[PDB]
Subunit: 147 residues, 2 copies
């Protein structure tokens, strides 16, 4: 598995807590500042897998006349179904039926407790948002299927 698939995010649509690809890896943004040297936005984030800190700045590109764009990359999250939960990990299933027996769940904002609560009251309607990067996969958020 190569680096996570991504989408382009306008810098003016980036806030604290958002997940961006910083130095090649998915990180939770904890600080947005301005570089004194370039005037560009600098992002400080926490690697979702290693929990290490990384920094990367945006840069300016000029697609068309008078159009200045400043963007960062965000990961494409996949949505898997939750079939079972067992000690820290879950049994997930992709849209096509591919079974992941031990999908890890990130320890952030009580995701596990919220996930387990939703599972015990509508298992089939519970979904996990998953980040896939260099072979690794991990549920980073949840979502009960809309009404």
């Amino acid at each position: 598995g190569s680096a996570s698939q991504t989408v382009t995010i306008p810098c003016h649509h980036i806030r604290l807590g958002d997940i961006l690809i910083l130095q090649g890896r998915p990180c939770q943004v904890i600080r947005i500042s301005t570089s004194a040297a370039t005037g560009q936005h600098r992002y400080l984030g926490v690697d979702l897998f290693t929990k290490q800190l990384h920094e990367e700045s945006s840069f300016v590109s000029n697609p068309a006349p008078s159009v200045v764009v400043q963007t960062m990359l965000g990961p494409v999250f996949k949505q898997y179904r939750v079939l079972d939960m067992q000690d820290g990990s879950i049994v997930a299933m992709t849209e096509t039926g591919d079974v992941k027996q031990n999908l890890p769940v990130i320890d952030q904002s009580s995701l596990w407790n919220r996930l387990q609560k939703a599972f015990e009251s509508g298992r089939g309607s519970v979904r996990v948002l998953v980040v896939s990067d260099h072979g690794r996969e991990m549920a980073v958020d949840m979502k009960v299927v809309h009404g």
Copy 2:
């Protein structure tokens, strides 16, 4: 001039105050809610030009297996230079030298006062972010060129 040029914005990167295209026009989002009928995000916004209220929901598309995307469109802002300011409007110039003698400035968050203040202390470094839609143009934000 056709409808404003746009970029795709992930719904999880949309917050109050952001400008989105709602019912075909640039609007400032003032409320984000969930539709009881579809479970999709519903956006209530104020048309930047007419100040009228509009609503539009996101919808789900499935690009790849297990990939569920929910997005809205945002306008592509152009950056013009400020050559002069005169009673409510400004003389702007595009990146290519095209002169707009009476570019209107939106009355939002004291943009005019902030703009005039910056102009009187670094005219050449002052830039205005401009929304272009169906022939109309208007400065909706400002930006002094980075360091």
